[PDB]
């Protein structure tokens, strides 16, 4: 298999600079050009450029030729963008992608959102949603508090996703932000399966599983 | 730079029913004998995926019910019958000359039939109110179409604020949406009430619905 693997979301300050990474794997890196394309938040697609890794000849749309830096580490199989002095503008999603002869773009990285912002990090808050409707039950995890985006969550390492639905985020007054990921499964077995969380705020370095069991009290005081 | 135009911005097609969405290049992206077109799908959070390179040639591994043609500036994406996880984005993009340029994209929305949603609350974790605040999370599960309206009841009297909600995308497997509406309380305010309900319109549903749970 085929493999781009793009370094982790980050939040810049404005006028500070970002070095992005794409790190490929499962074939000879220096045999395909890469591109970086820039996709800006609810919009399309903008080439920002292309380079030769073999030779190191770049190309750039002309619009990026003073924010983009283009460089490889040929020896790492690694491709890298940096982003000169943000502001506002750059806040948006940055794939690598590859391409066999600078035409169509066959392999794309997962992305990196990069959000300028003065703000600082902050890593989120992780609570339950302990489990009925048509015999079915929801659980689900409540992400609280984080910035900047994003938030990724799986359900058991990646073993359960039919049902799940992980919500988009919402702005918080606070301009923290939070998301819930939530699951239906059956009611028969909420005592024999076991369903776990794992949220991920790249950001923050924040990586953690939360078991959500079901709700088991006659004593009120 | 030259500028490719999709059209339509929103194509809505029918569970199984043809969709035909169109990409004009402001100028020819043809010799005689290939076309420097290529079609992407981006399905939600994903990035783009090759489907069709030079106009016409499915790239493998994609279903064989897409399918593109034309040549000079007016190029097409069909496809034959749609699935549900052909819920995308699409997009067009040349490679004729110095800078490839990307189509607006074509968000591709499917009609399924309509589905009123299975609603559940949850009261604050524990863990939660140990913080001093408490969320309440009312869902509302698998409805087909997006409108419905959500409003909290907190001892039986209308909340005018401290509610905040988000809707997904369709989903890749059944073409649904789902919705969150998240009440939040400081722990006093959860405390000094009883009765915390969530009431749910959507059209196929022909009364309102609450869920709702006691403290």
């Known amino acids: 298999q085929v493999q781009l693997v793009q370094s982790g979301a980050e939040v810049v300050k404005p006028g500070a600079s970002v070095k992005l990474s794409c790190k490929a794997s499962?074939?000879?890196?220096?045999?395909?050009?890469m591109y970086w394309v820039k996709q800006a938040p609810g919009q399309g697609l903008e080439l920002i450029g292309e380079?030769?890794?073999?030779?190191?000849?770049?190309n750039f749309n002309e619009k990026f030729k003073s924010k983009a830096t283009l460089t490889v580490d040929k020896s790492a199989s690694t491709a890298y963008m940096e982003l000169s002095s943000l502001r506002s503008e750059d806040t948006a999603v940055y794939y690598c992608?590859?391409?066999?002869?600078?035409?169509?773009?066959?392999?794309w990285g997962q992305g990196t959102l990069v959000t300028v912002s003065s703000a600082s990090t902050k890593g989120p808050s992780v609570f339950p949603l302990a489990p009925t409707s048509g015999g079915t039950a929801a659980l689900g995890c409540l992400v609280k508090d984080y910035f900047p985006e994003p938030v990724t969550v799986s359900w058991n390492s990646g073993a359960l996703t039919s049902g799940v639905h992980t919500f988009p985020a919402v702005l918080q007054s606070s301009g923290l932000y939070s998301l819930s990921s939530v699951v239906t499964v059956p009611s028969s077995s909420l005592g024999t399966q076991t369903y776990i969380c794992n949220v991920n705020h790249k950001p923050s370095n924040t990586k953690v599983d939360k078991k959500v069991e079901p709700k088991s009290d006659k004593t009120h005081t | 730079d030259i500028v490719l135009t999709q059209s339509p911005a929103t194509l809505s097609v029918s569970p199984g029913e043809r969709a035909t969405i169109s990409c004009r290049a402001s100028?020819?992206?043809?010799?005689?004998?290939?076309?420097?077109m290529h079609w992407y799908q981006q399905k939600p959070g994903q990035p783009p995926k090759l489907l069709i390179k030079?106009?016409?040639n499915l790239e493998s591994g994609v279903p064989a019910r897409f399918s593109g043609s034309g040549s000079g500036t007016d190029f097409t994406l069909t496809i034959s019958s749609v699935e549900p996880e052909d819920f995308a984005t699409y997009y067009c993009?040349?490679?004729?000359?110095?800078?490839?340029?990307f189509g607006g994209g074509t968000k591709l929305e499917i009609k399924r039939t309509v589905a009123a949603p299975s609603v559940f609350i949850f009261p604050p974790s524990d863990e939660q109110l140990k913080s001093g605040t408490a969320s309440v999370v009312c869902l509302l599960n698998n409805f087909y179409p997006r409108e419905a309206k959500v409003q909290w009841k907190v001892d039986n009297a209308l909340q005018s604020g401290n509610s905040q909600e988000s809707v997904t995308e369709q989903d890749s497997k059944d073409s649904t949406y789902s919705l969150s509406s998240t009440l939040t309380l400081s722990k006093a305010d959860y405390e000094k009430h009883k009765v915390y309900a969530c009431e749910v319109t959507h059209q196929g549903l022909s009364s309102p619905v609450t869920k709702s749970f006691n403290r």
């Open positions: 992608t590859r391409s066999d002869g600078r035409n169509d773009m066959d392999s």
């Open positions: 499962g074939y000879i890196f220096t045999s395909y050009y």
């Open positions: 380079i030769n890794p073999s030779n190191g000849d770049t």
């Open positions: 100028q020819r992206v043809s010799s005689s004998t290939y076309s420097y």
């Open positions: 030079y106009a016409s």
């Open positions: 993009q040349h490679s004729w000359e110095x800078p490839p340029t």
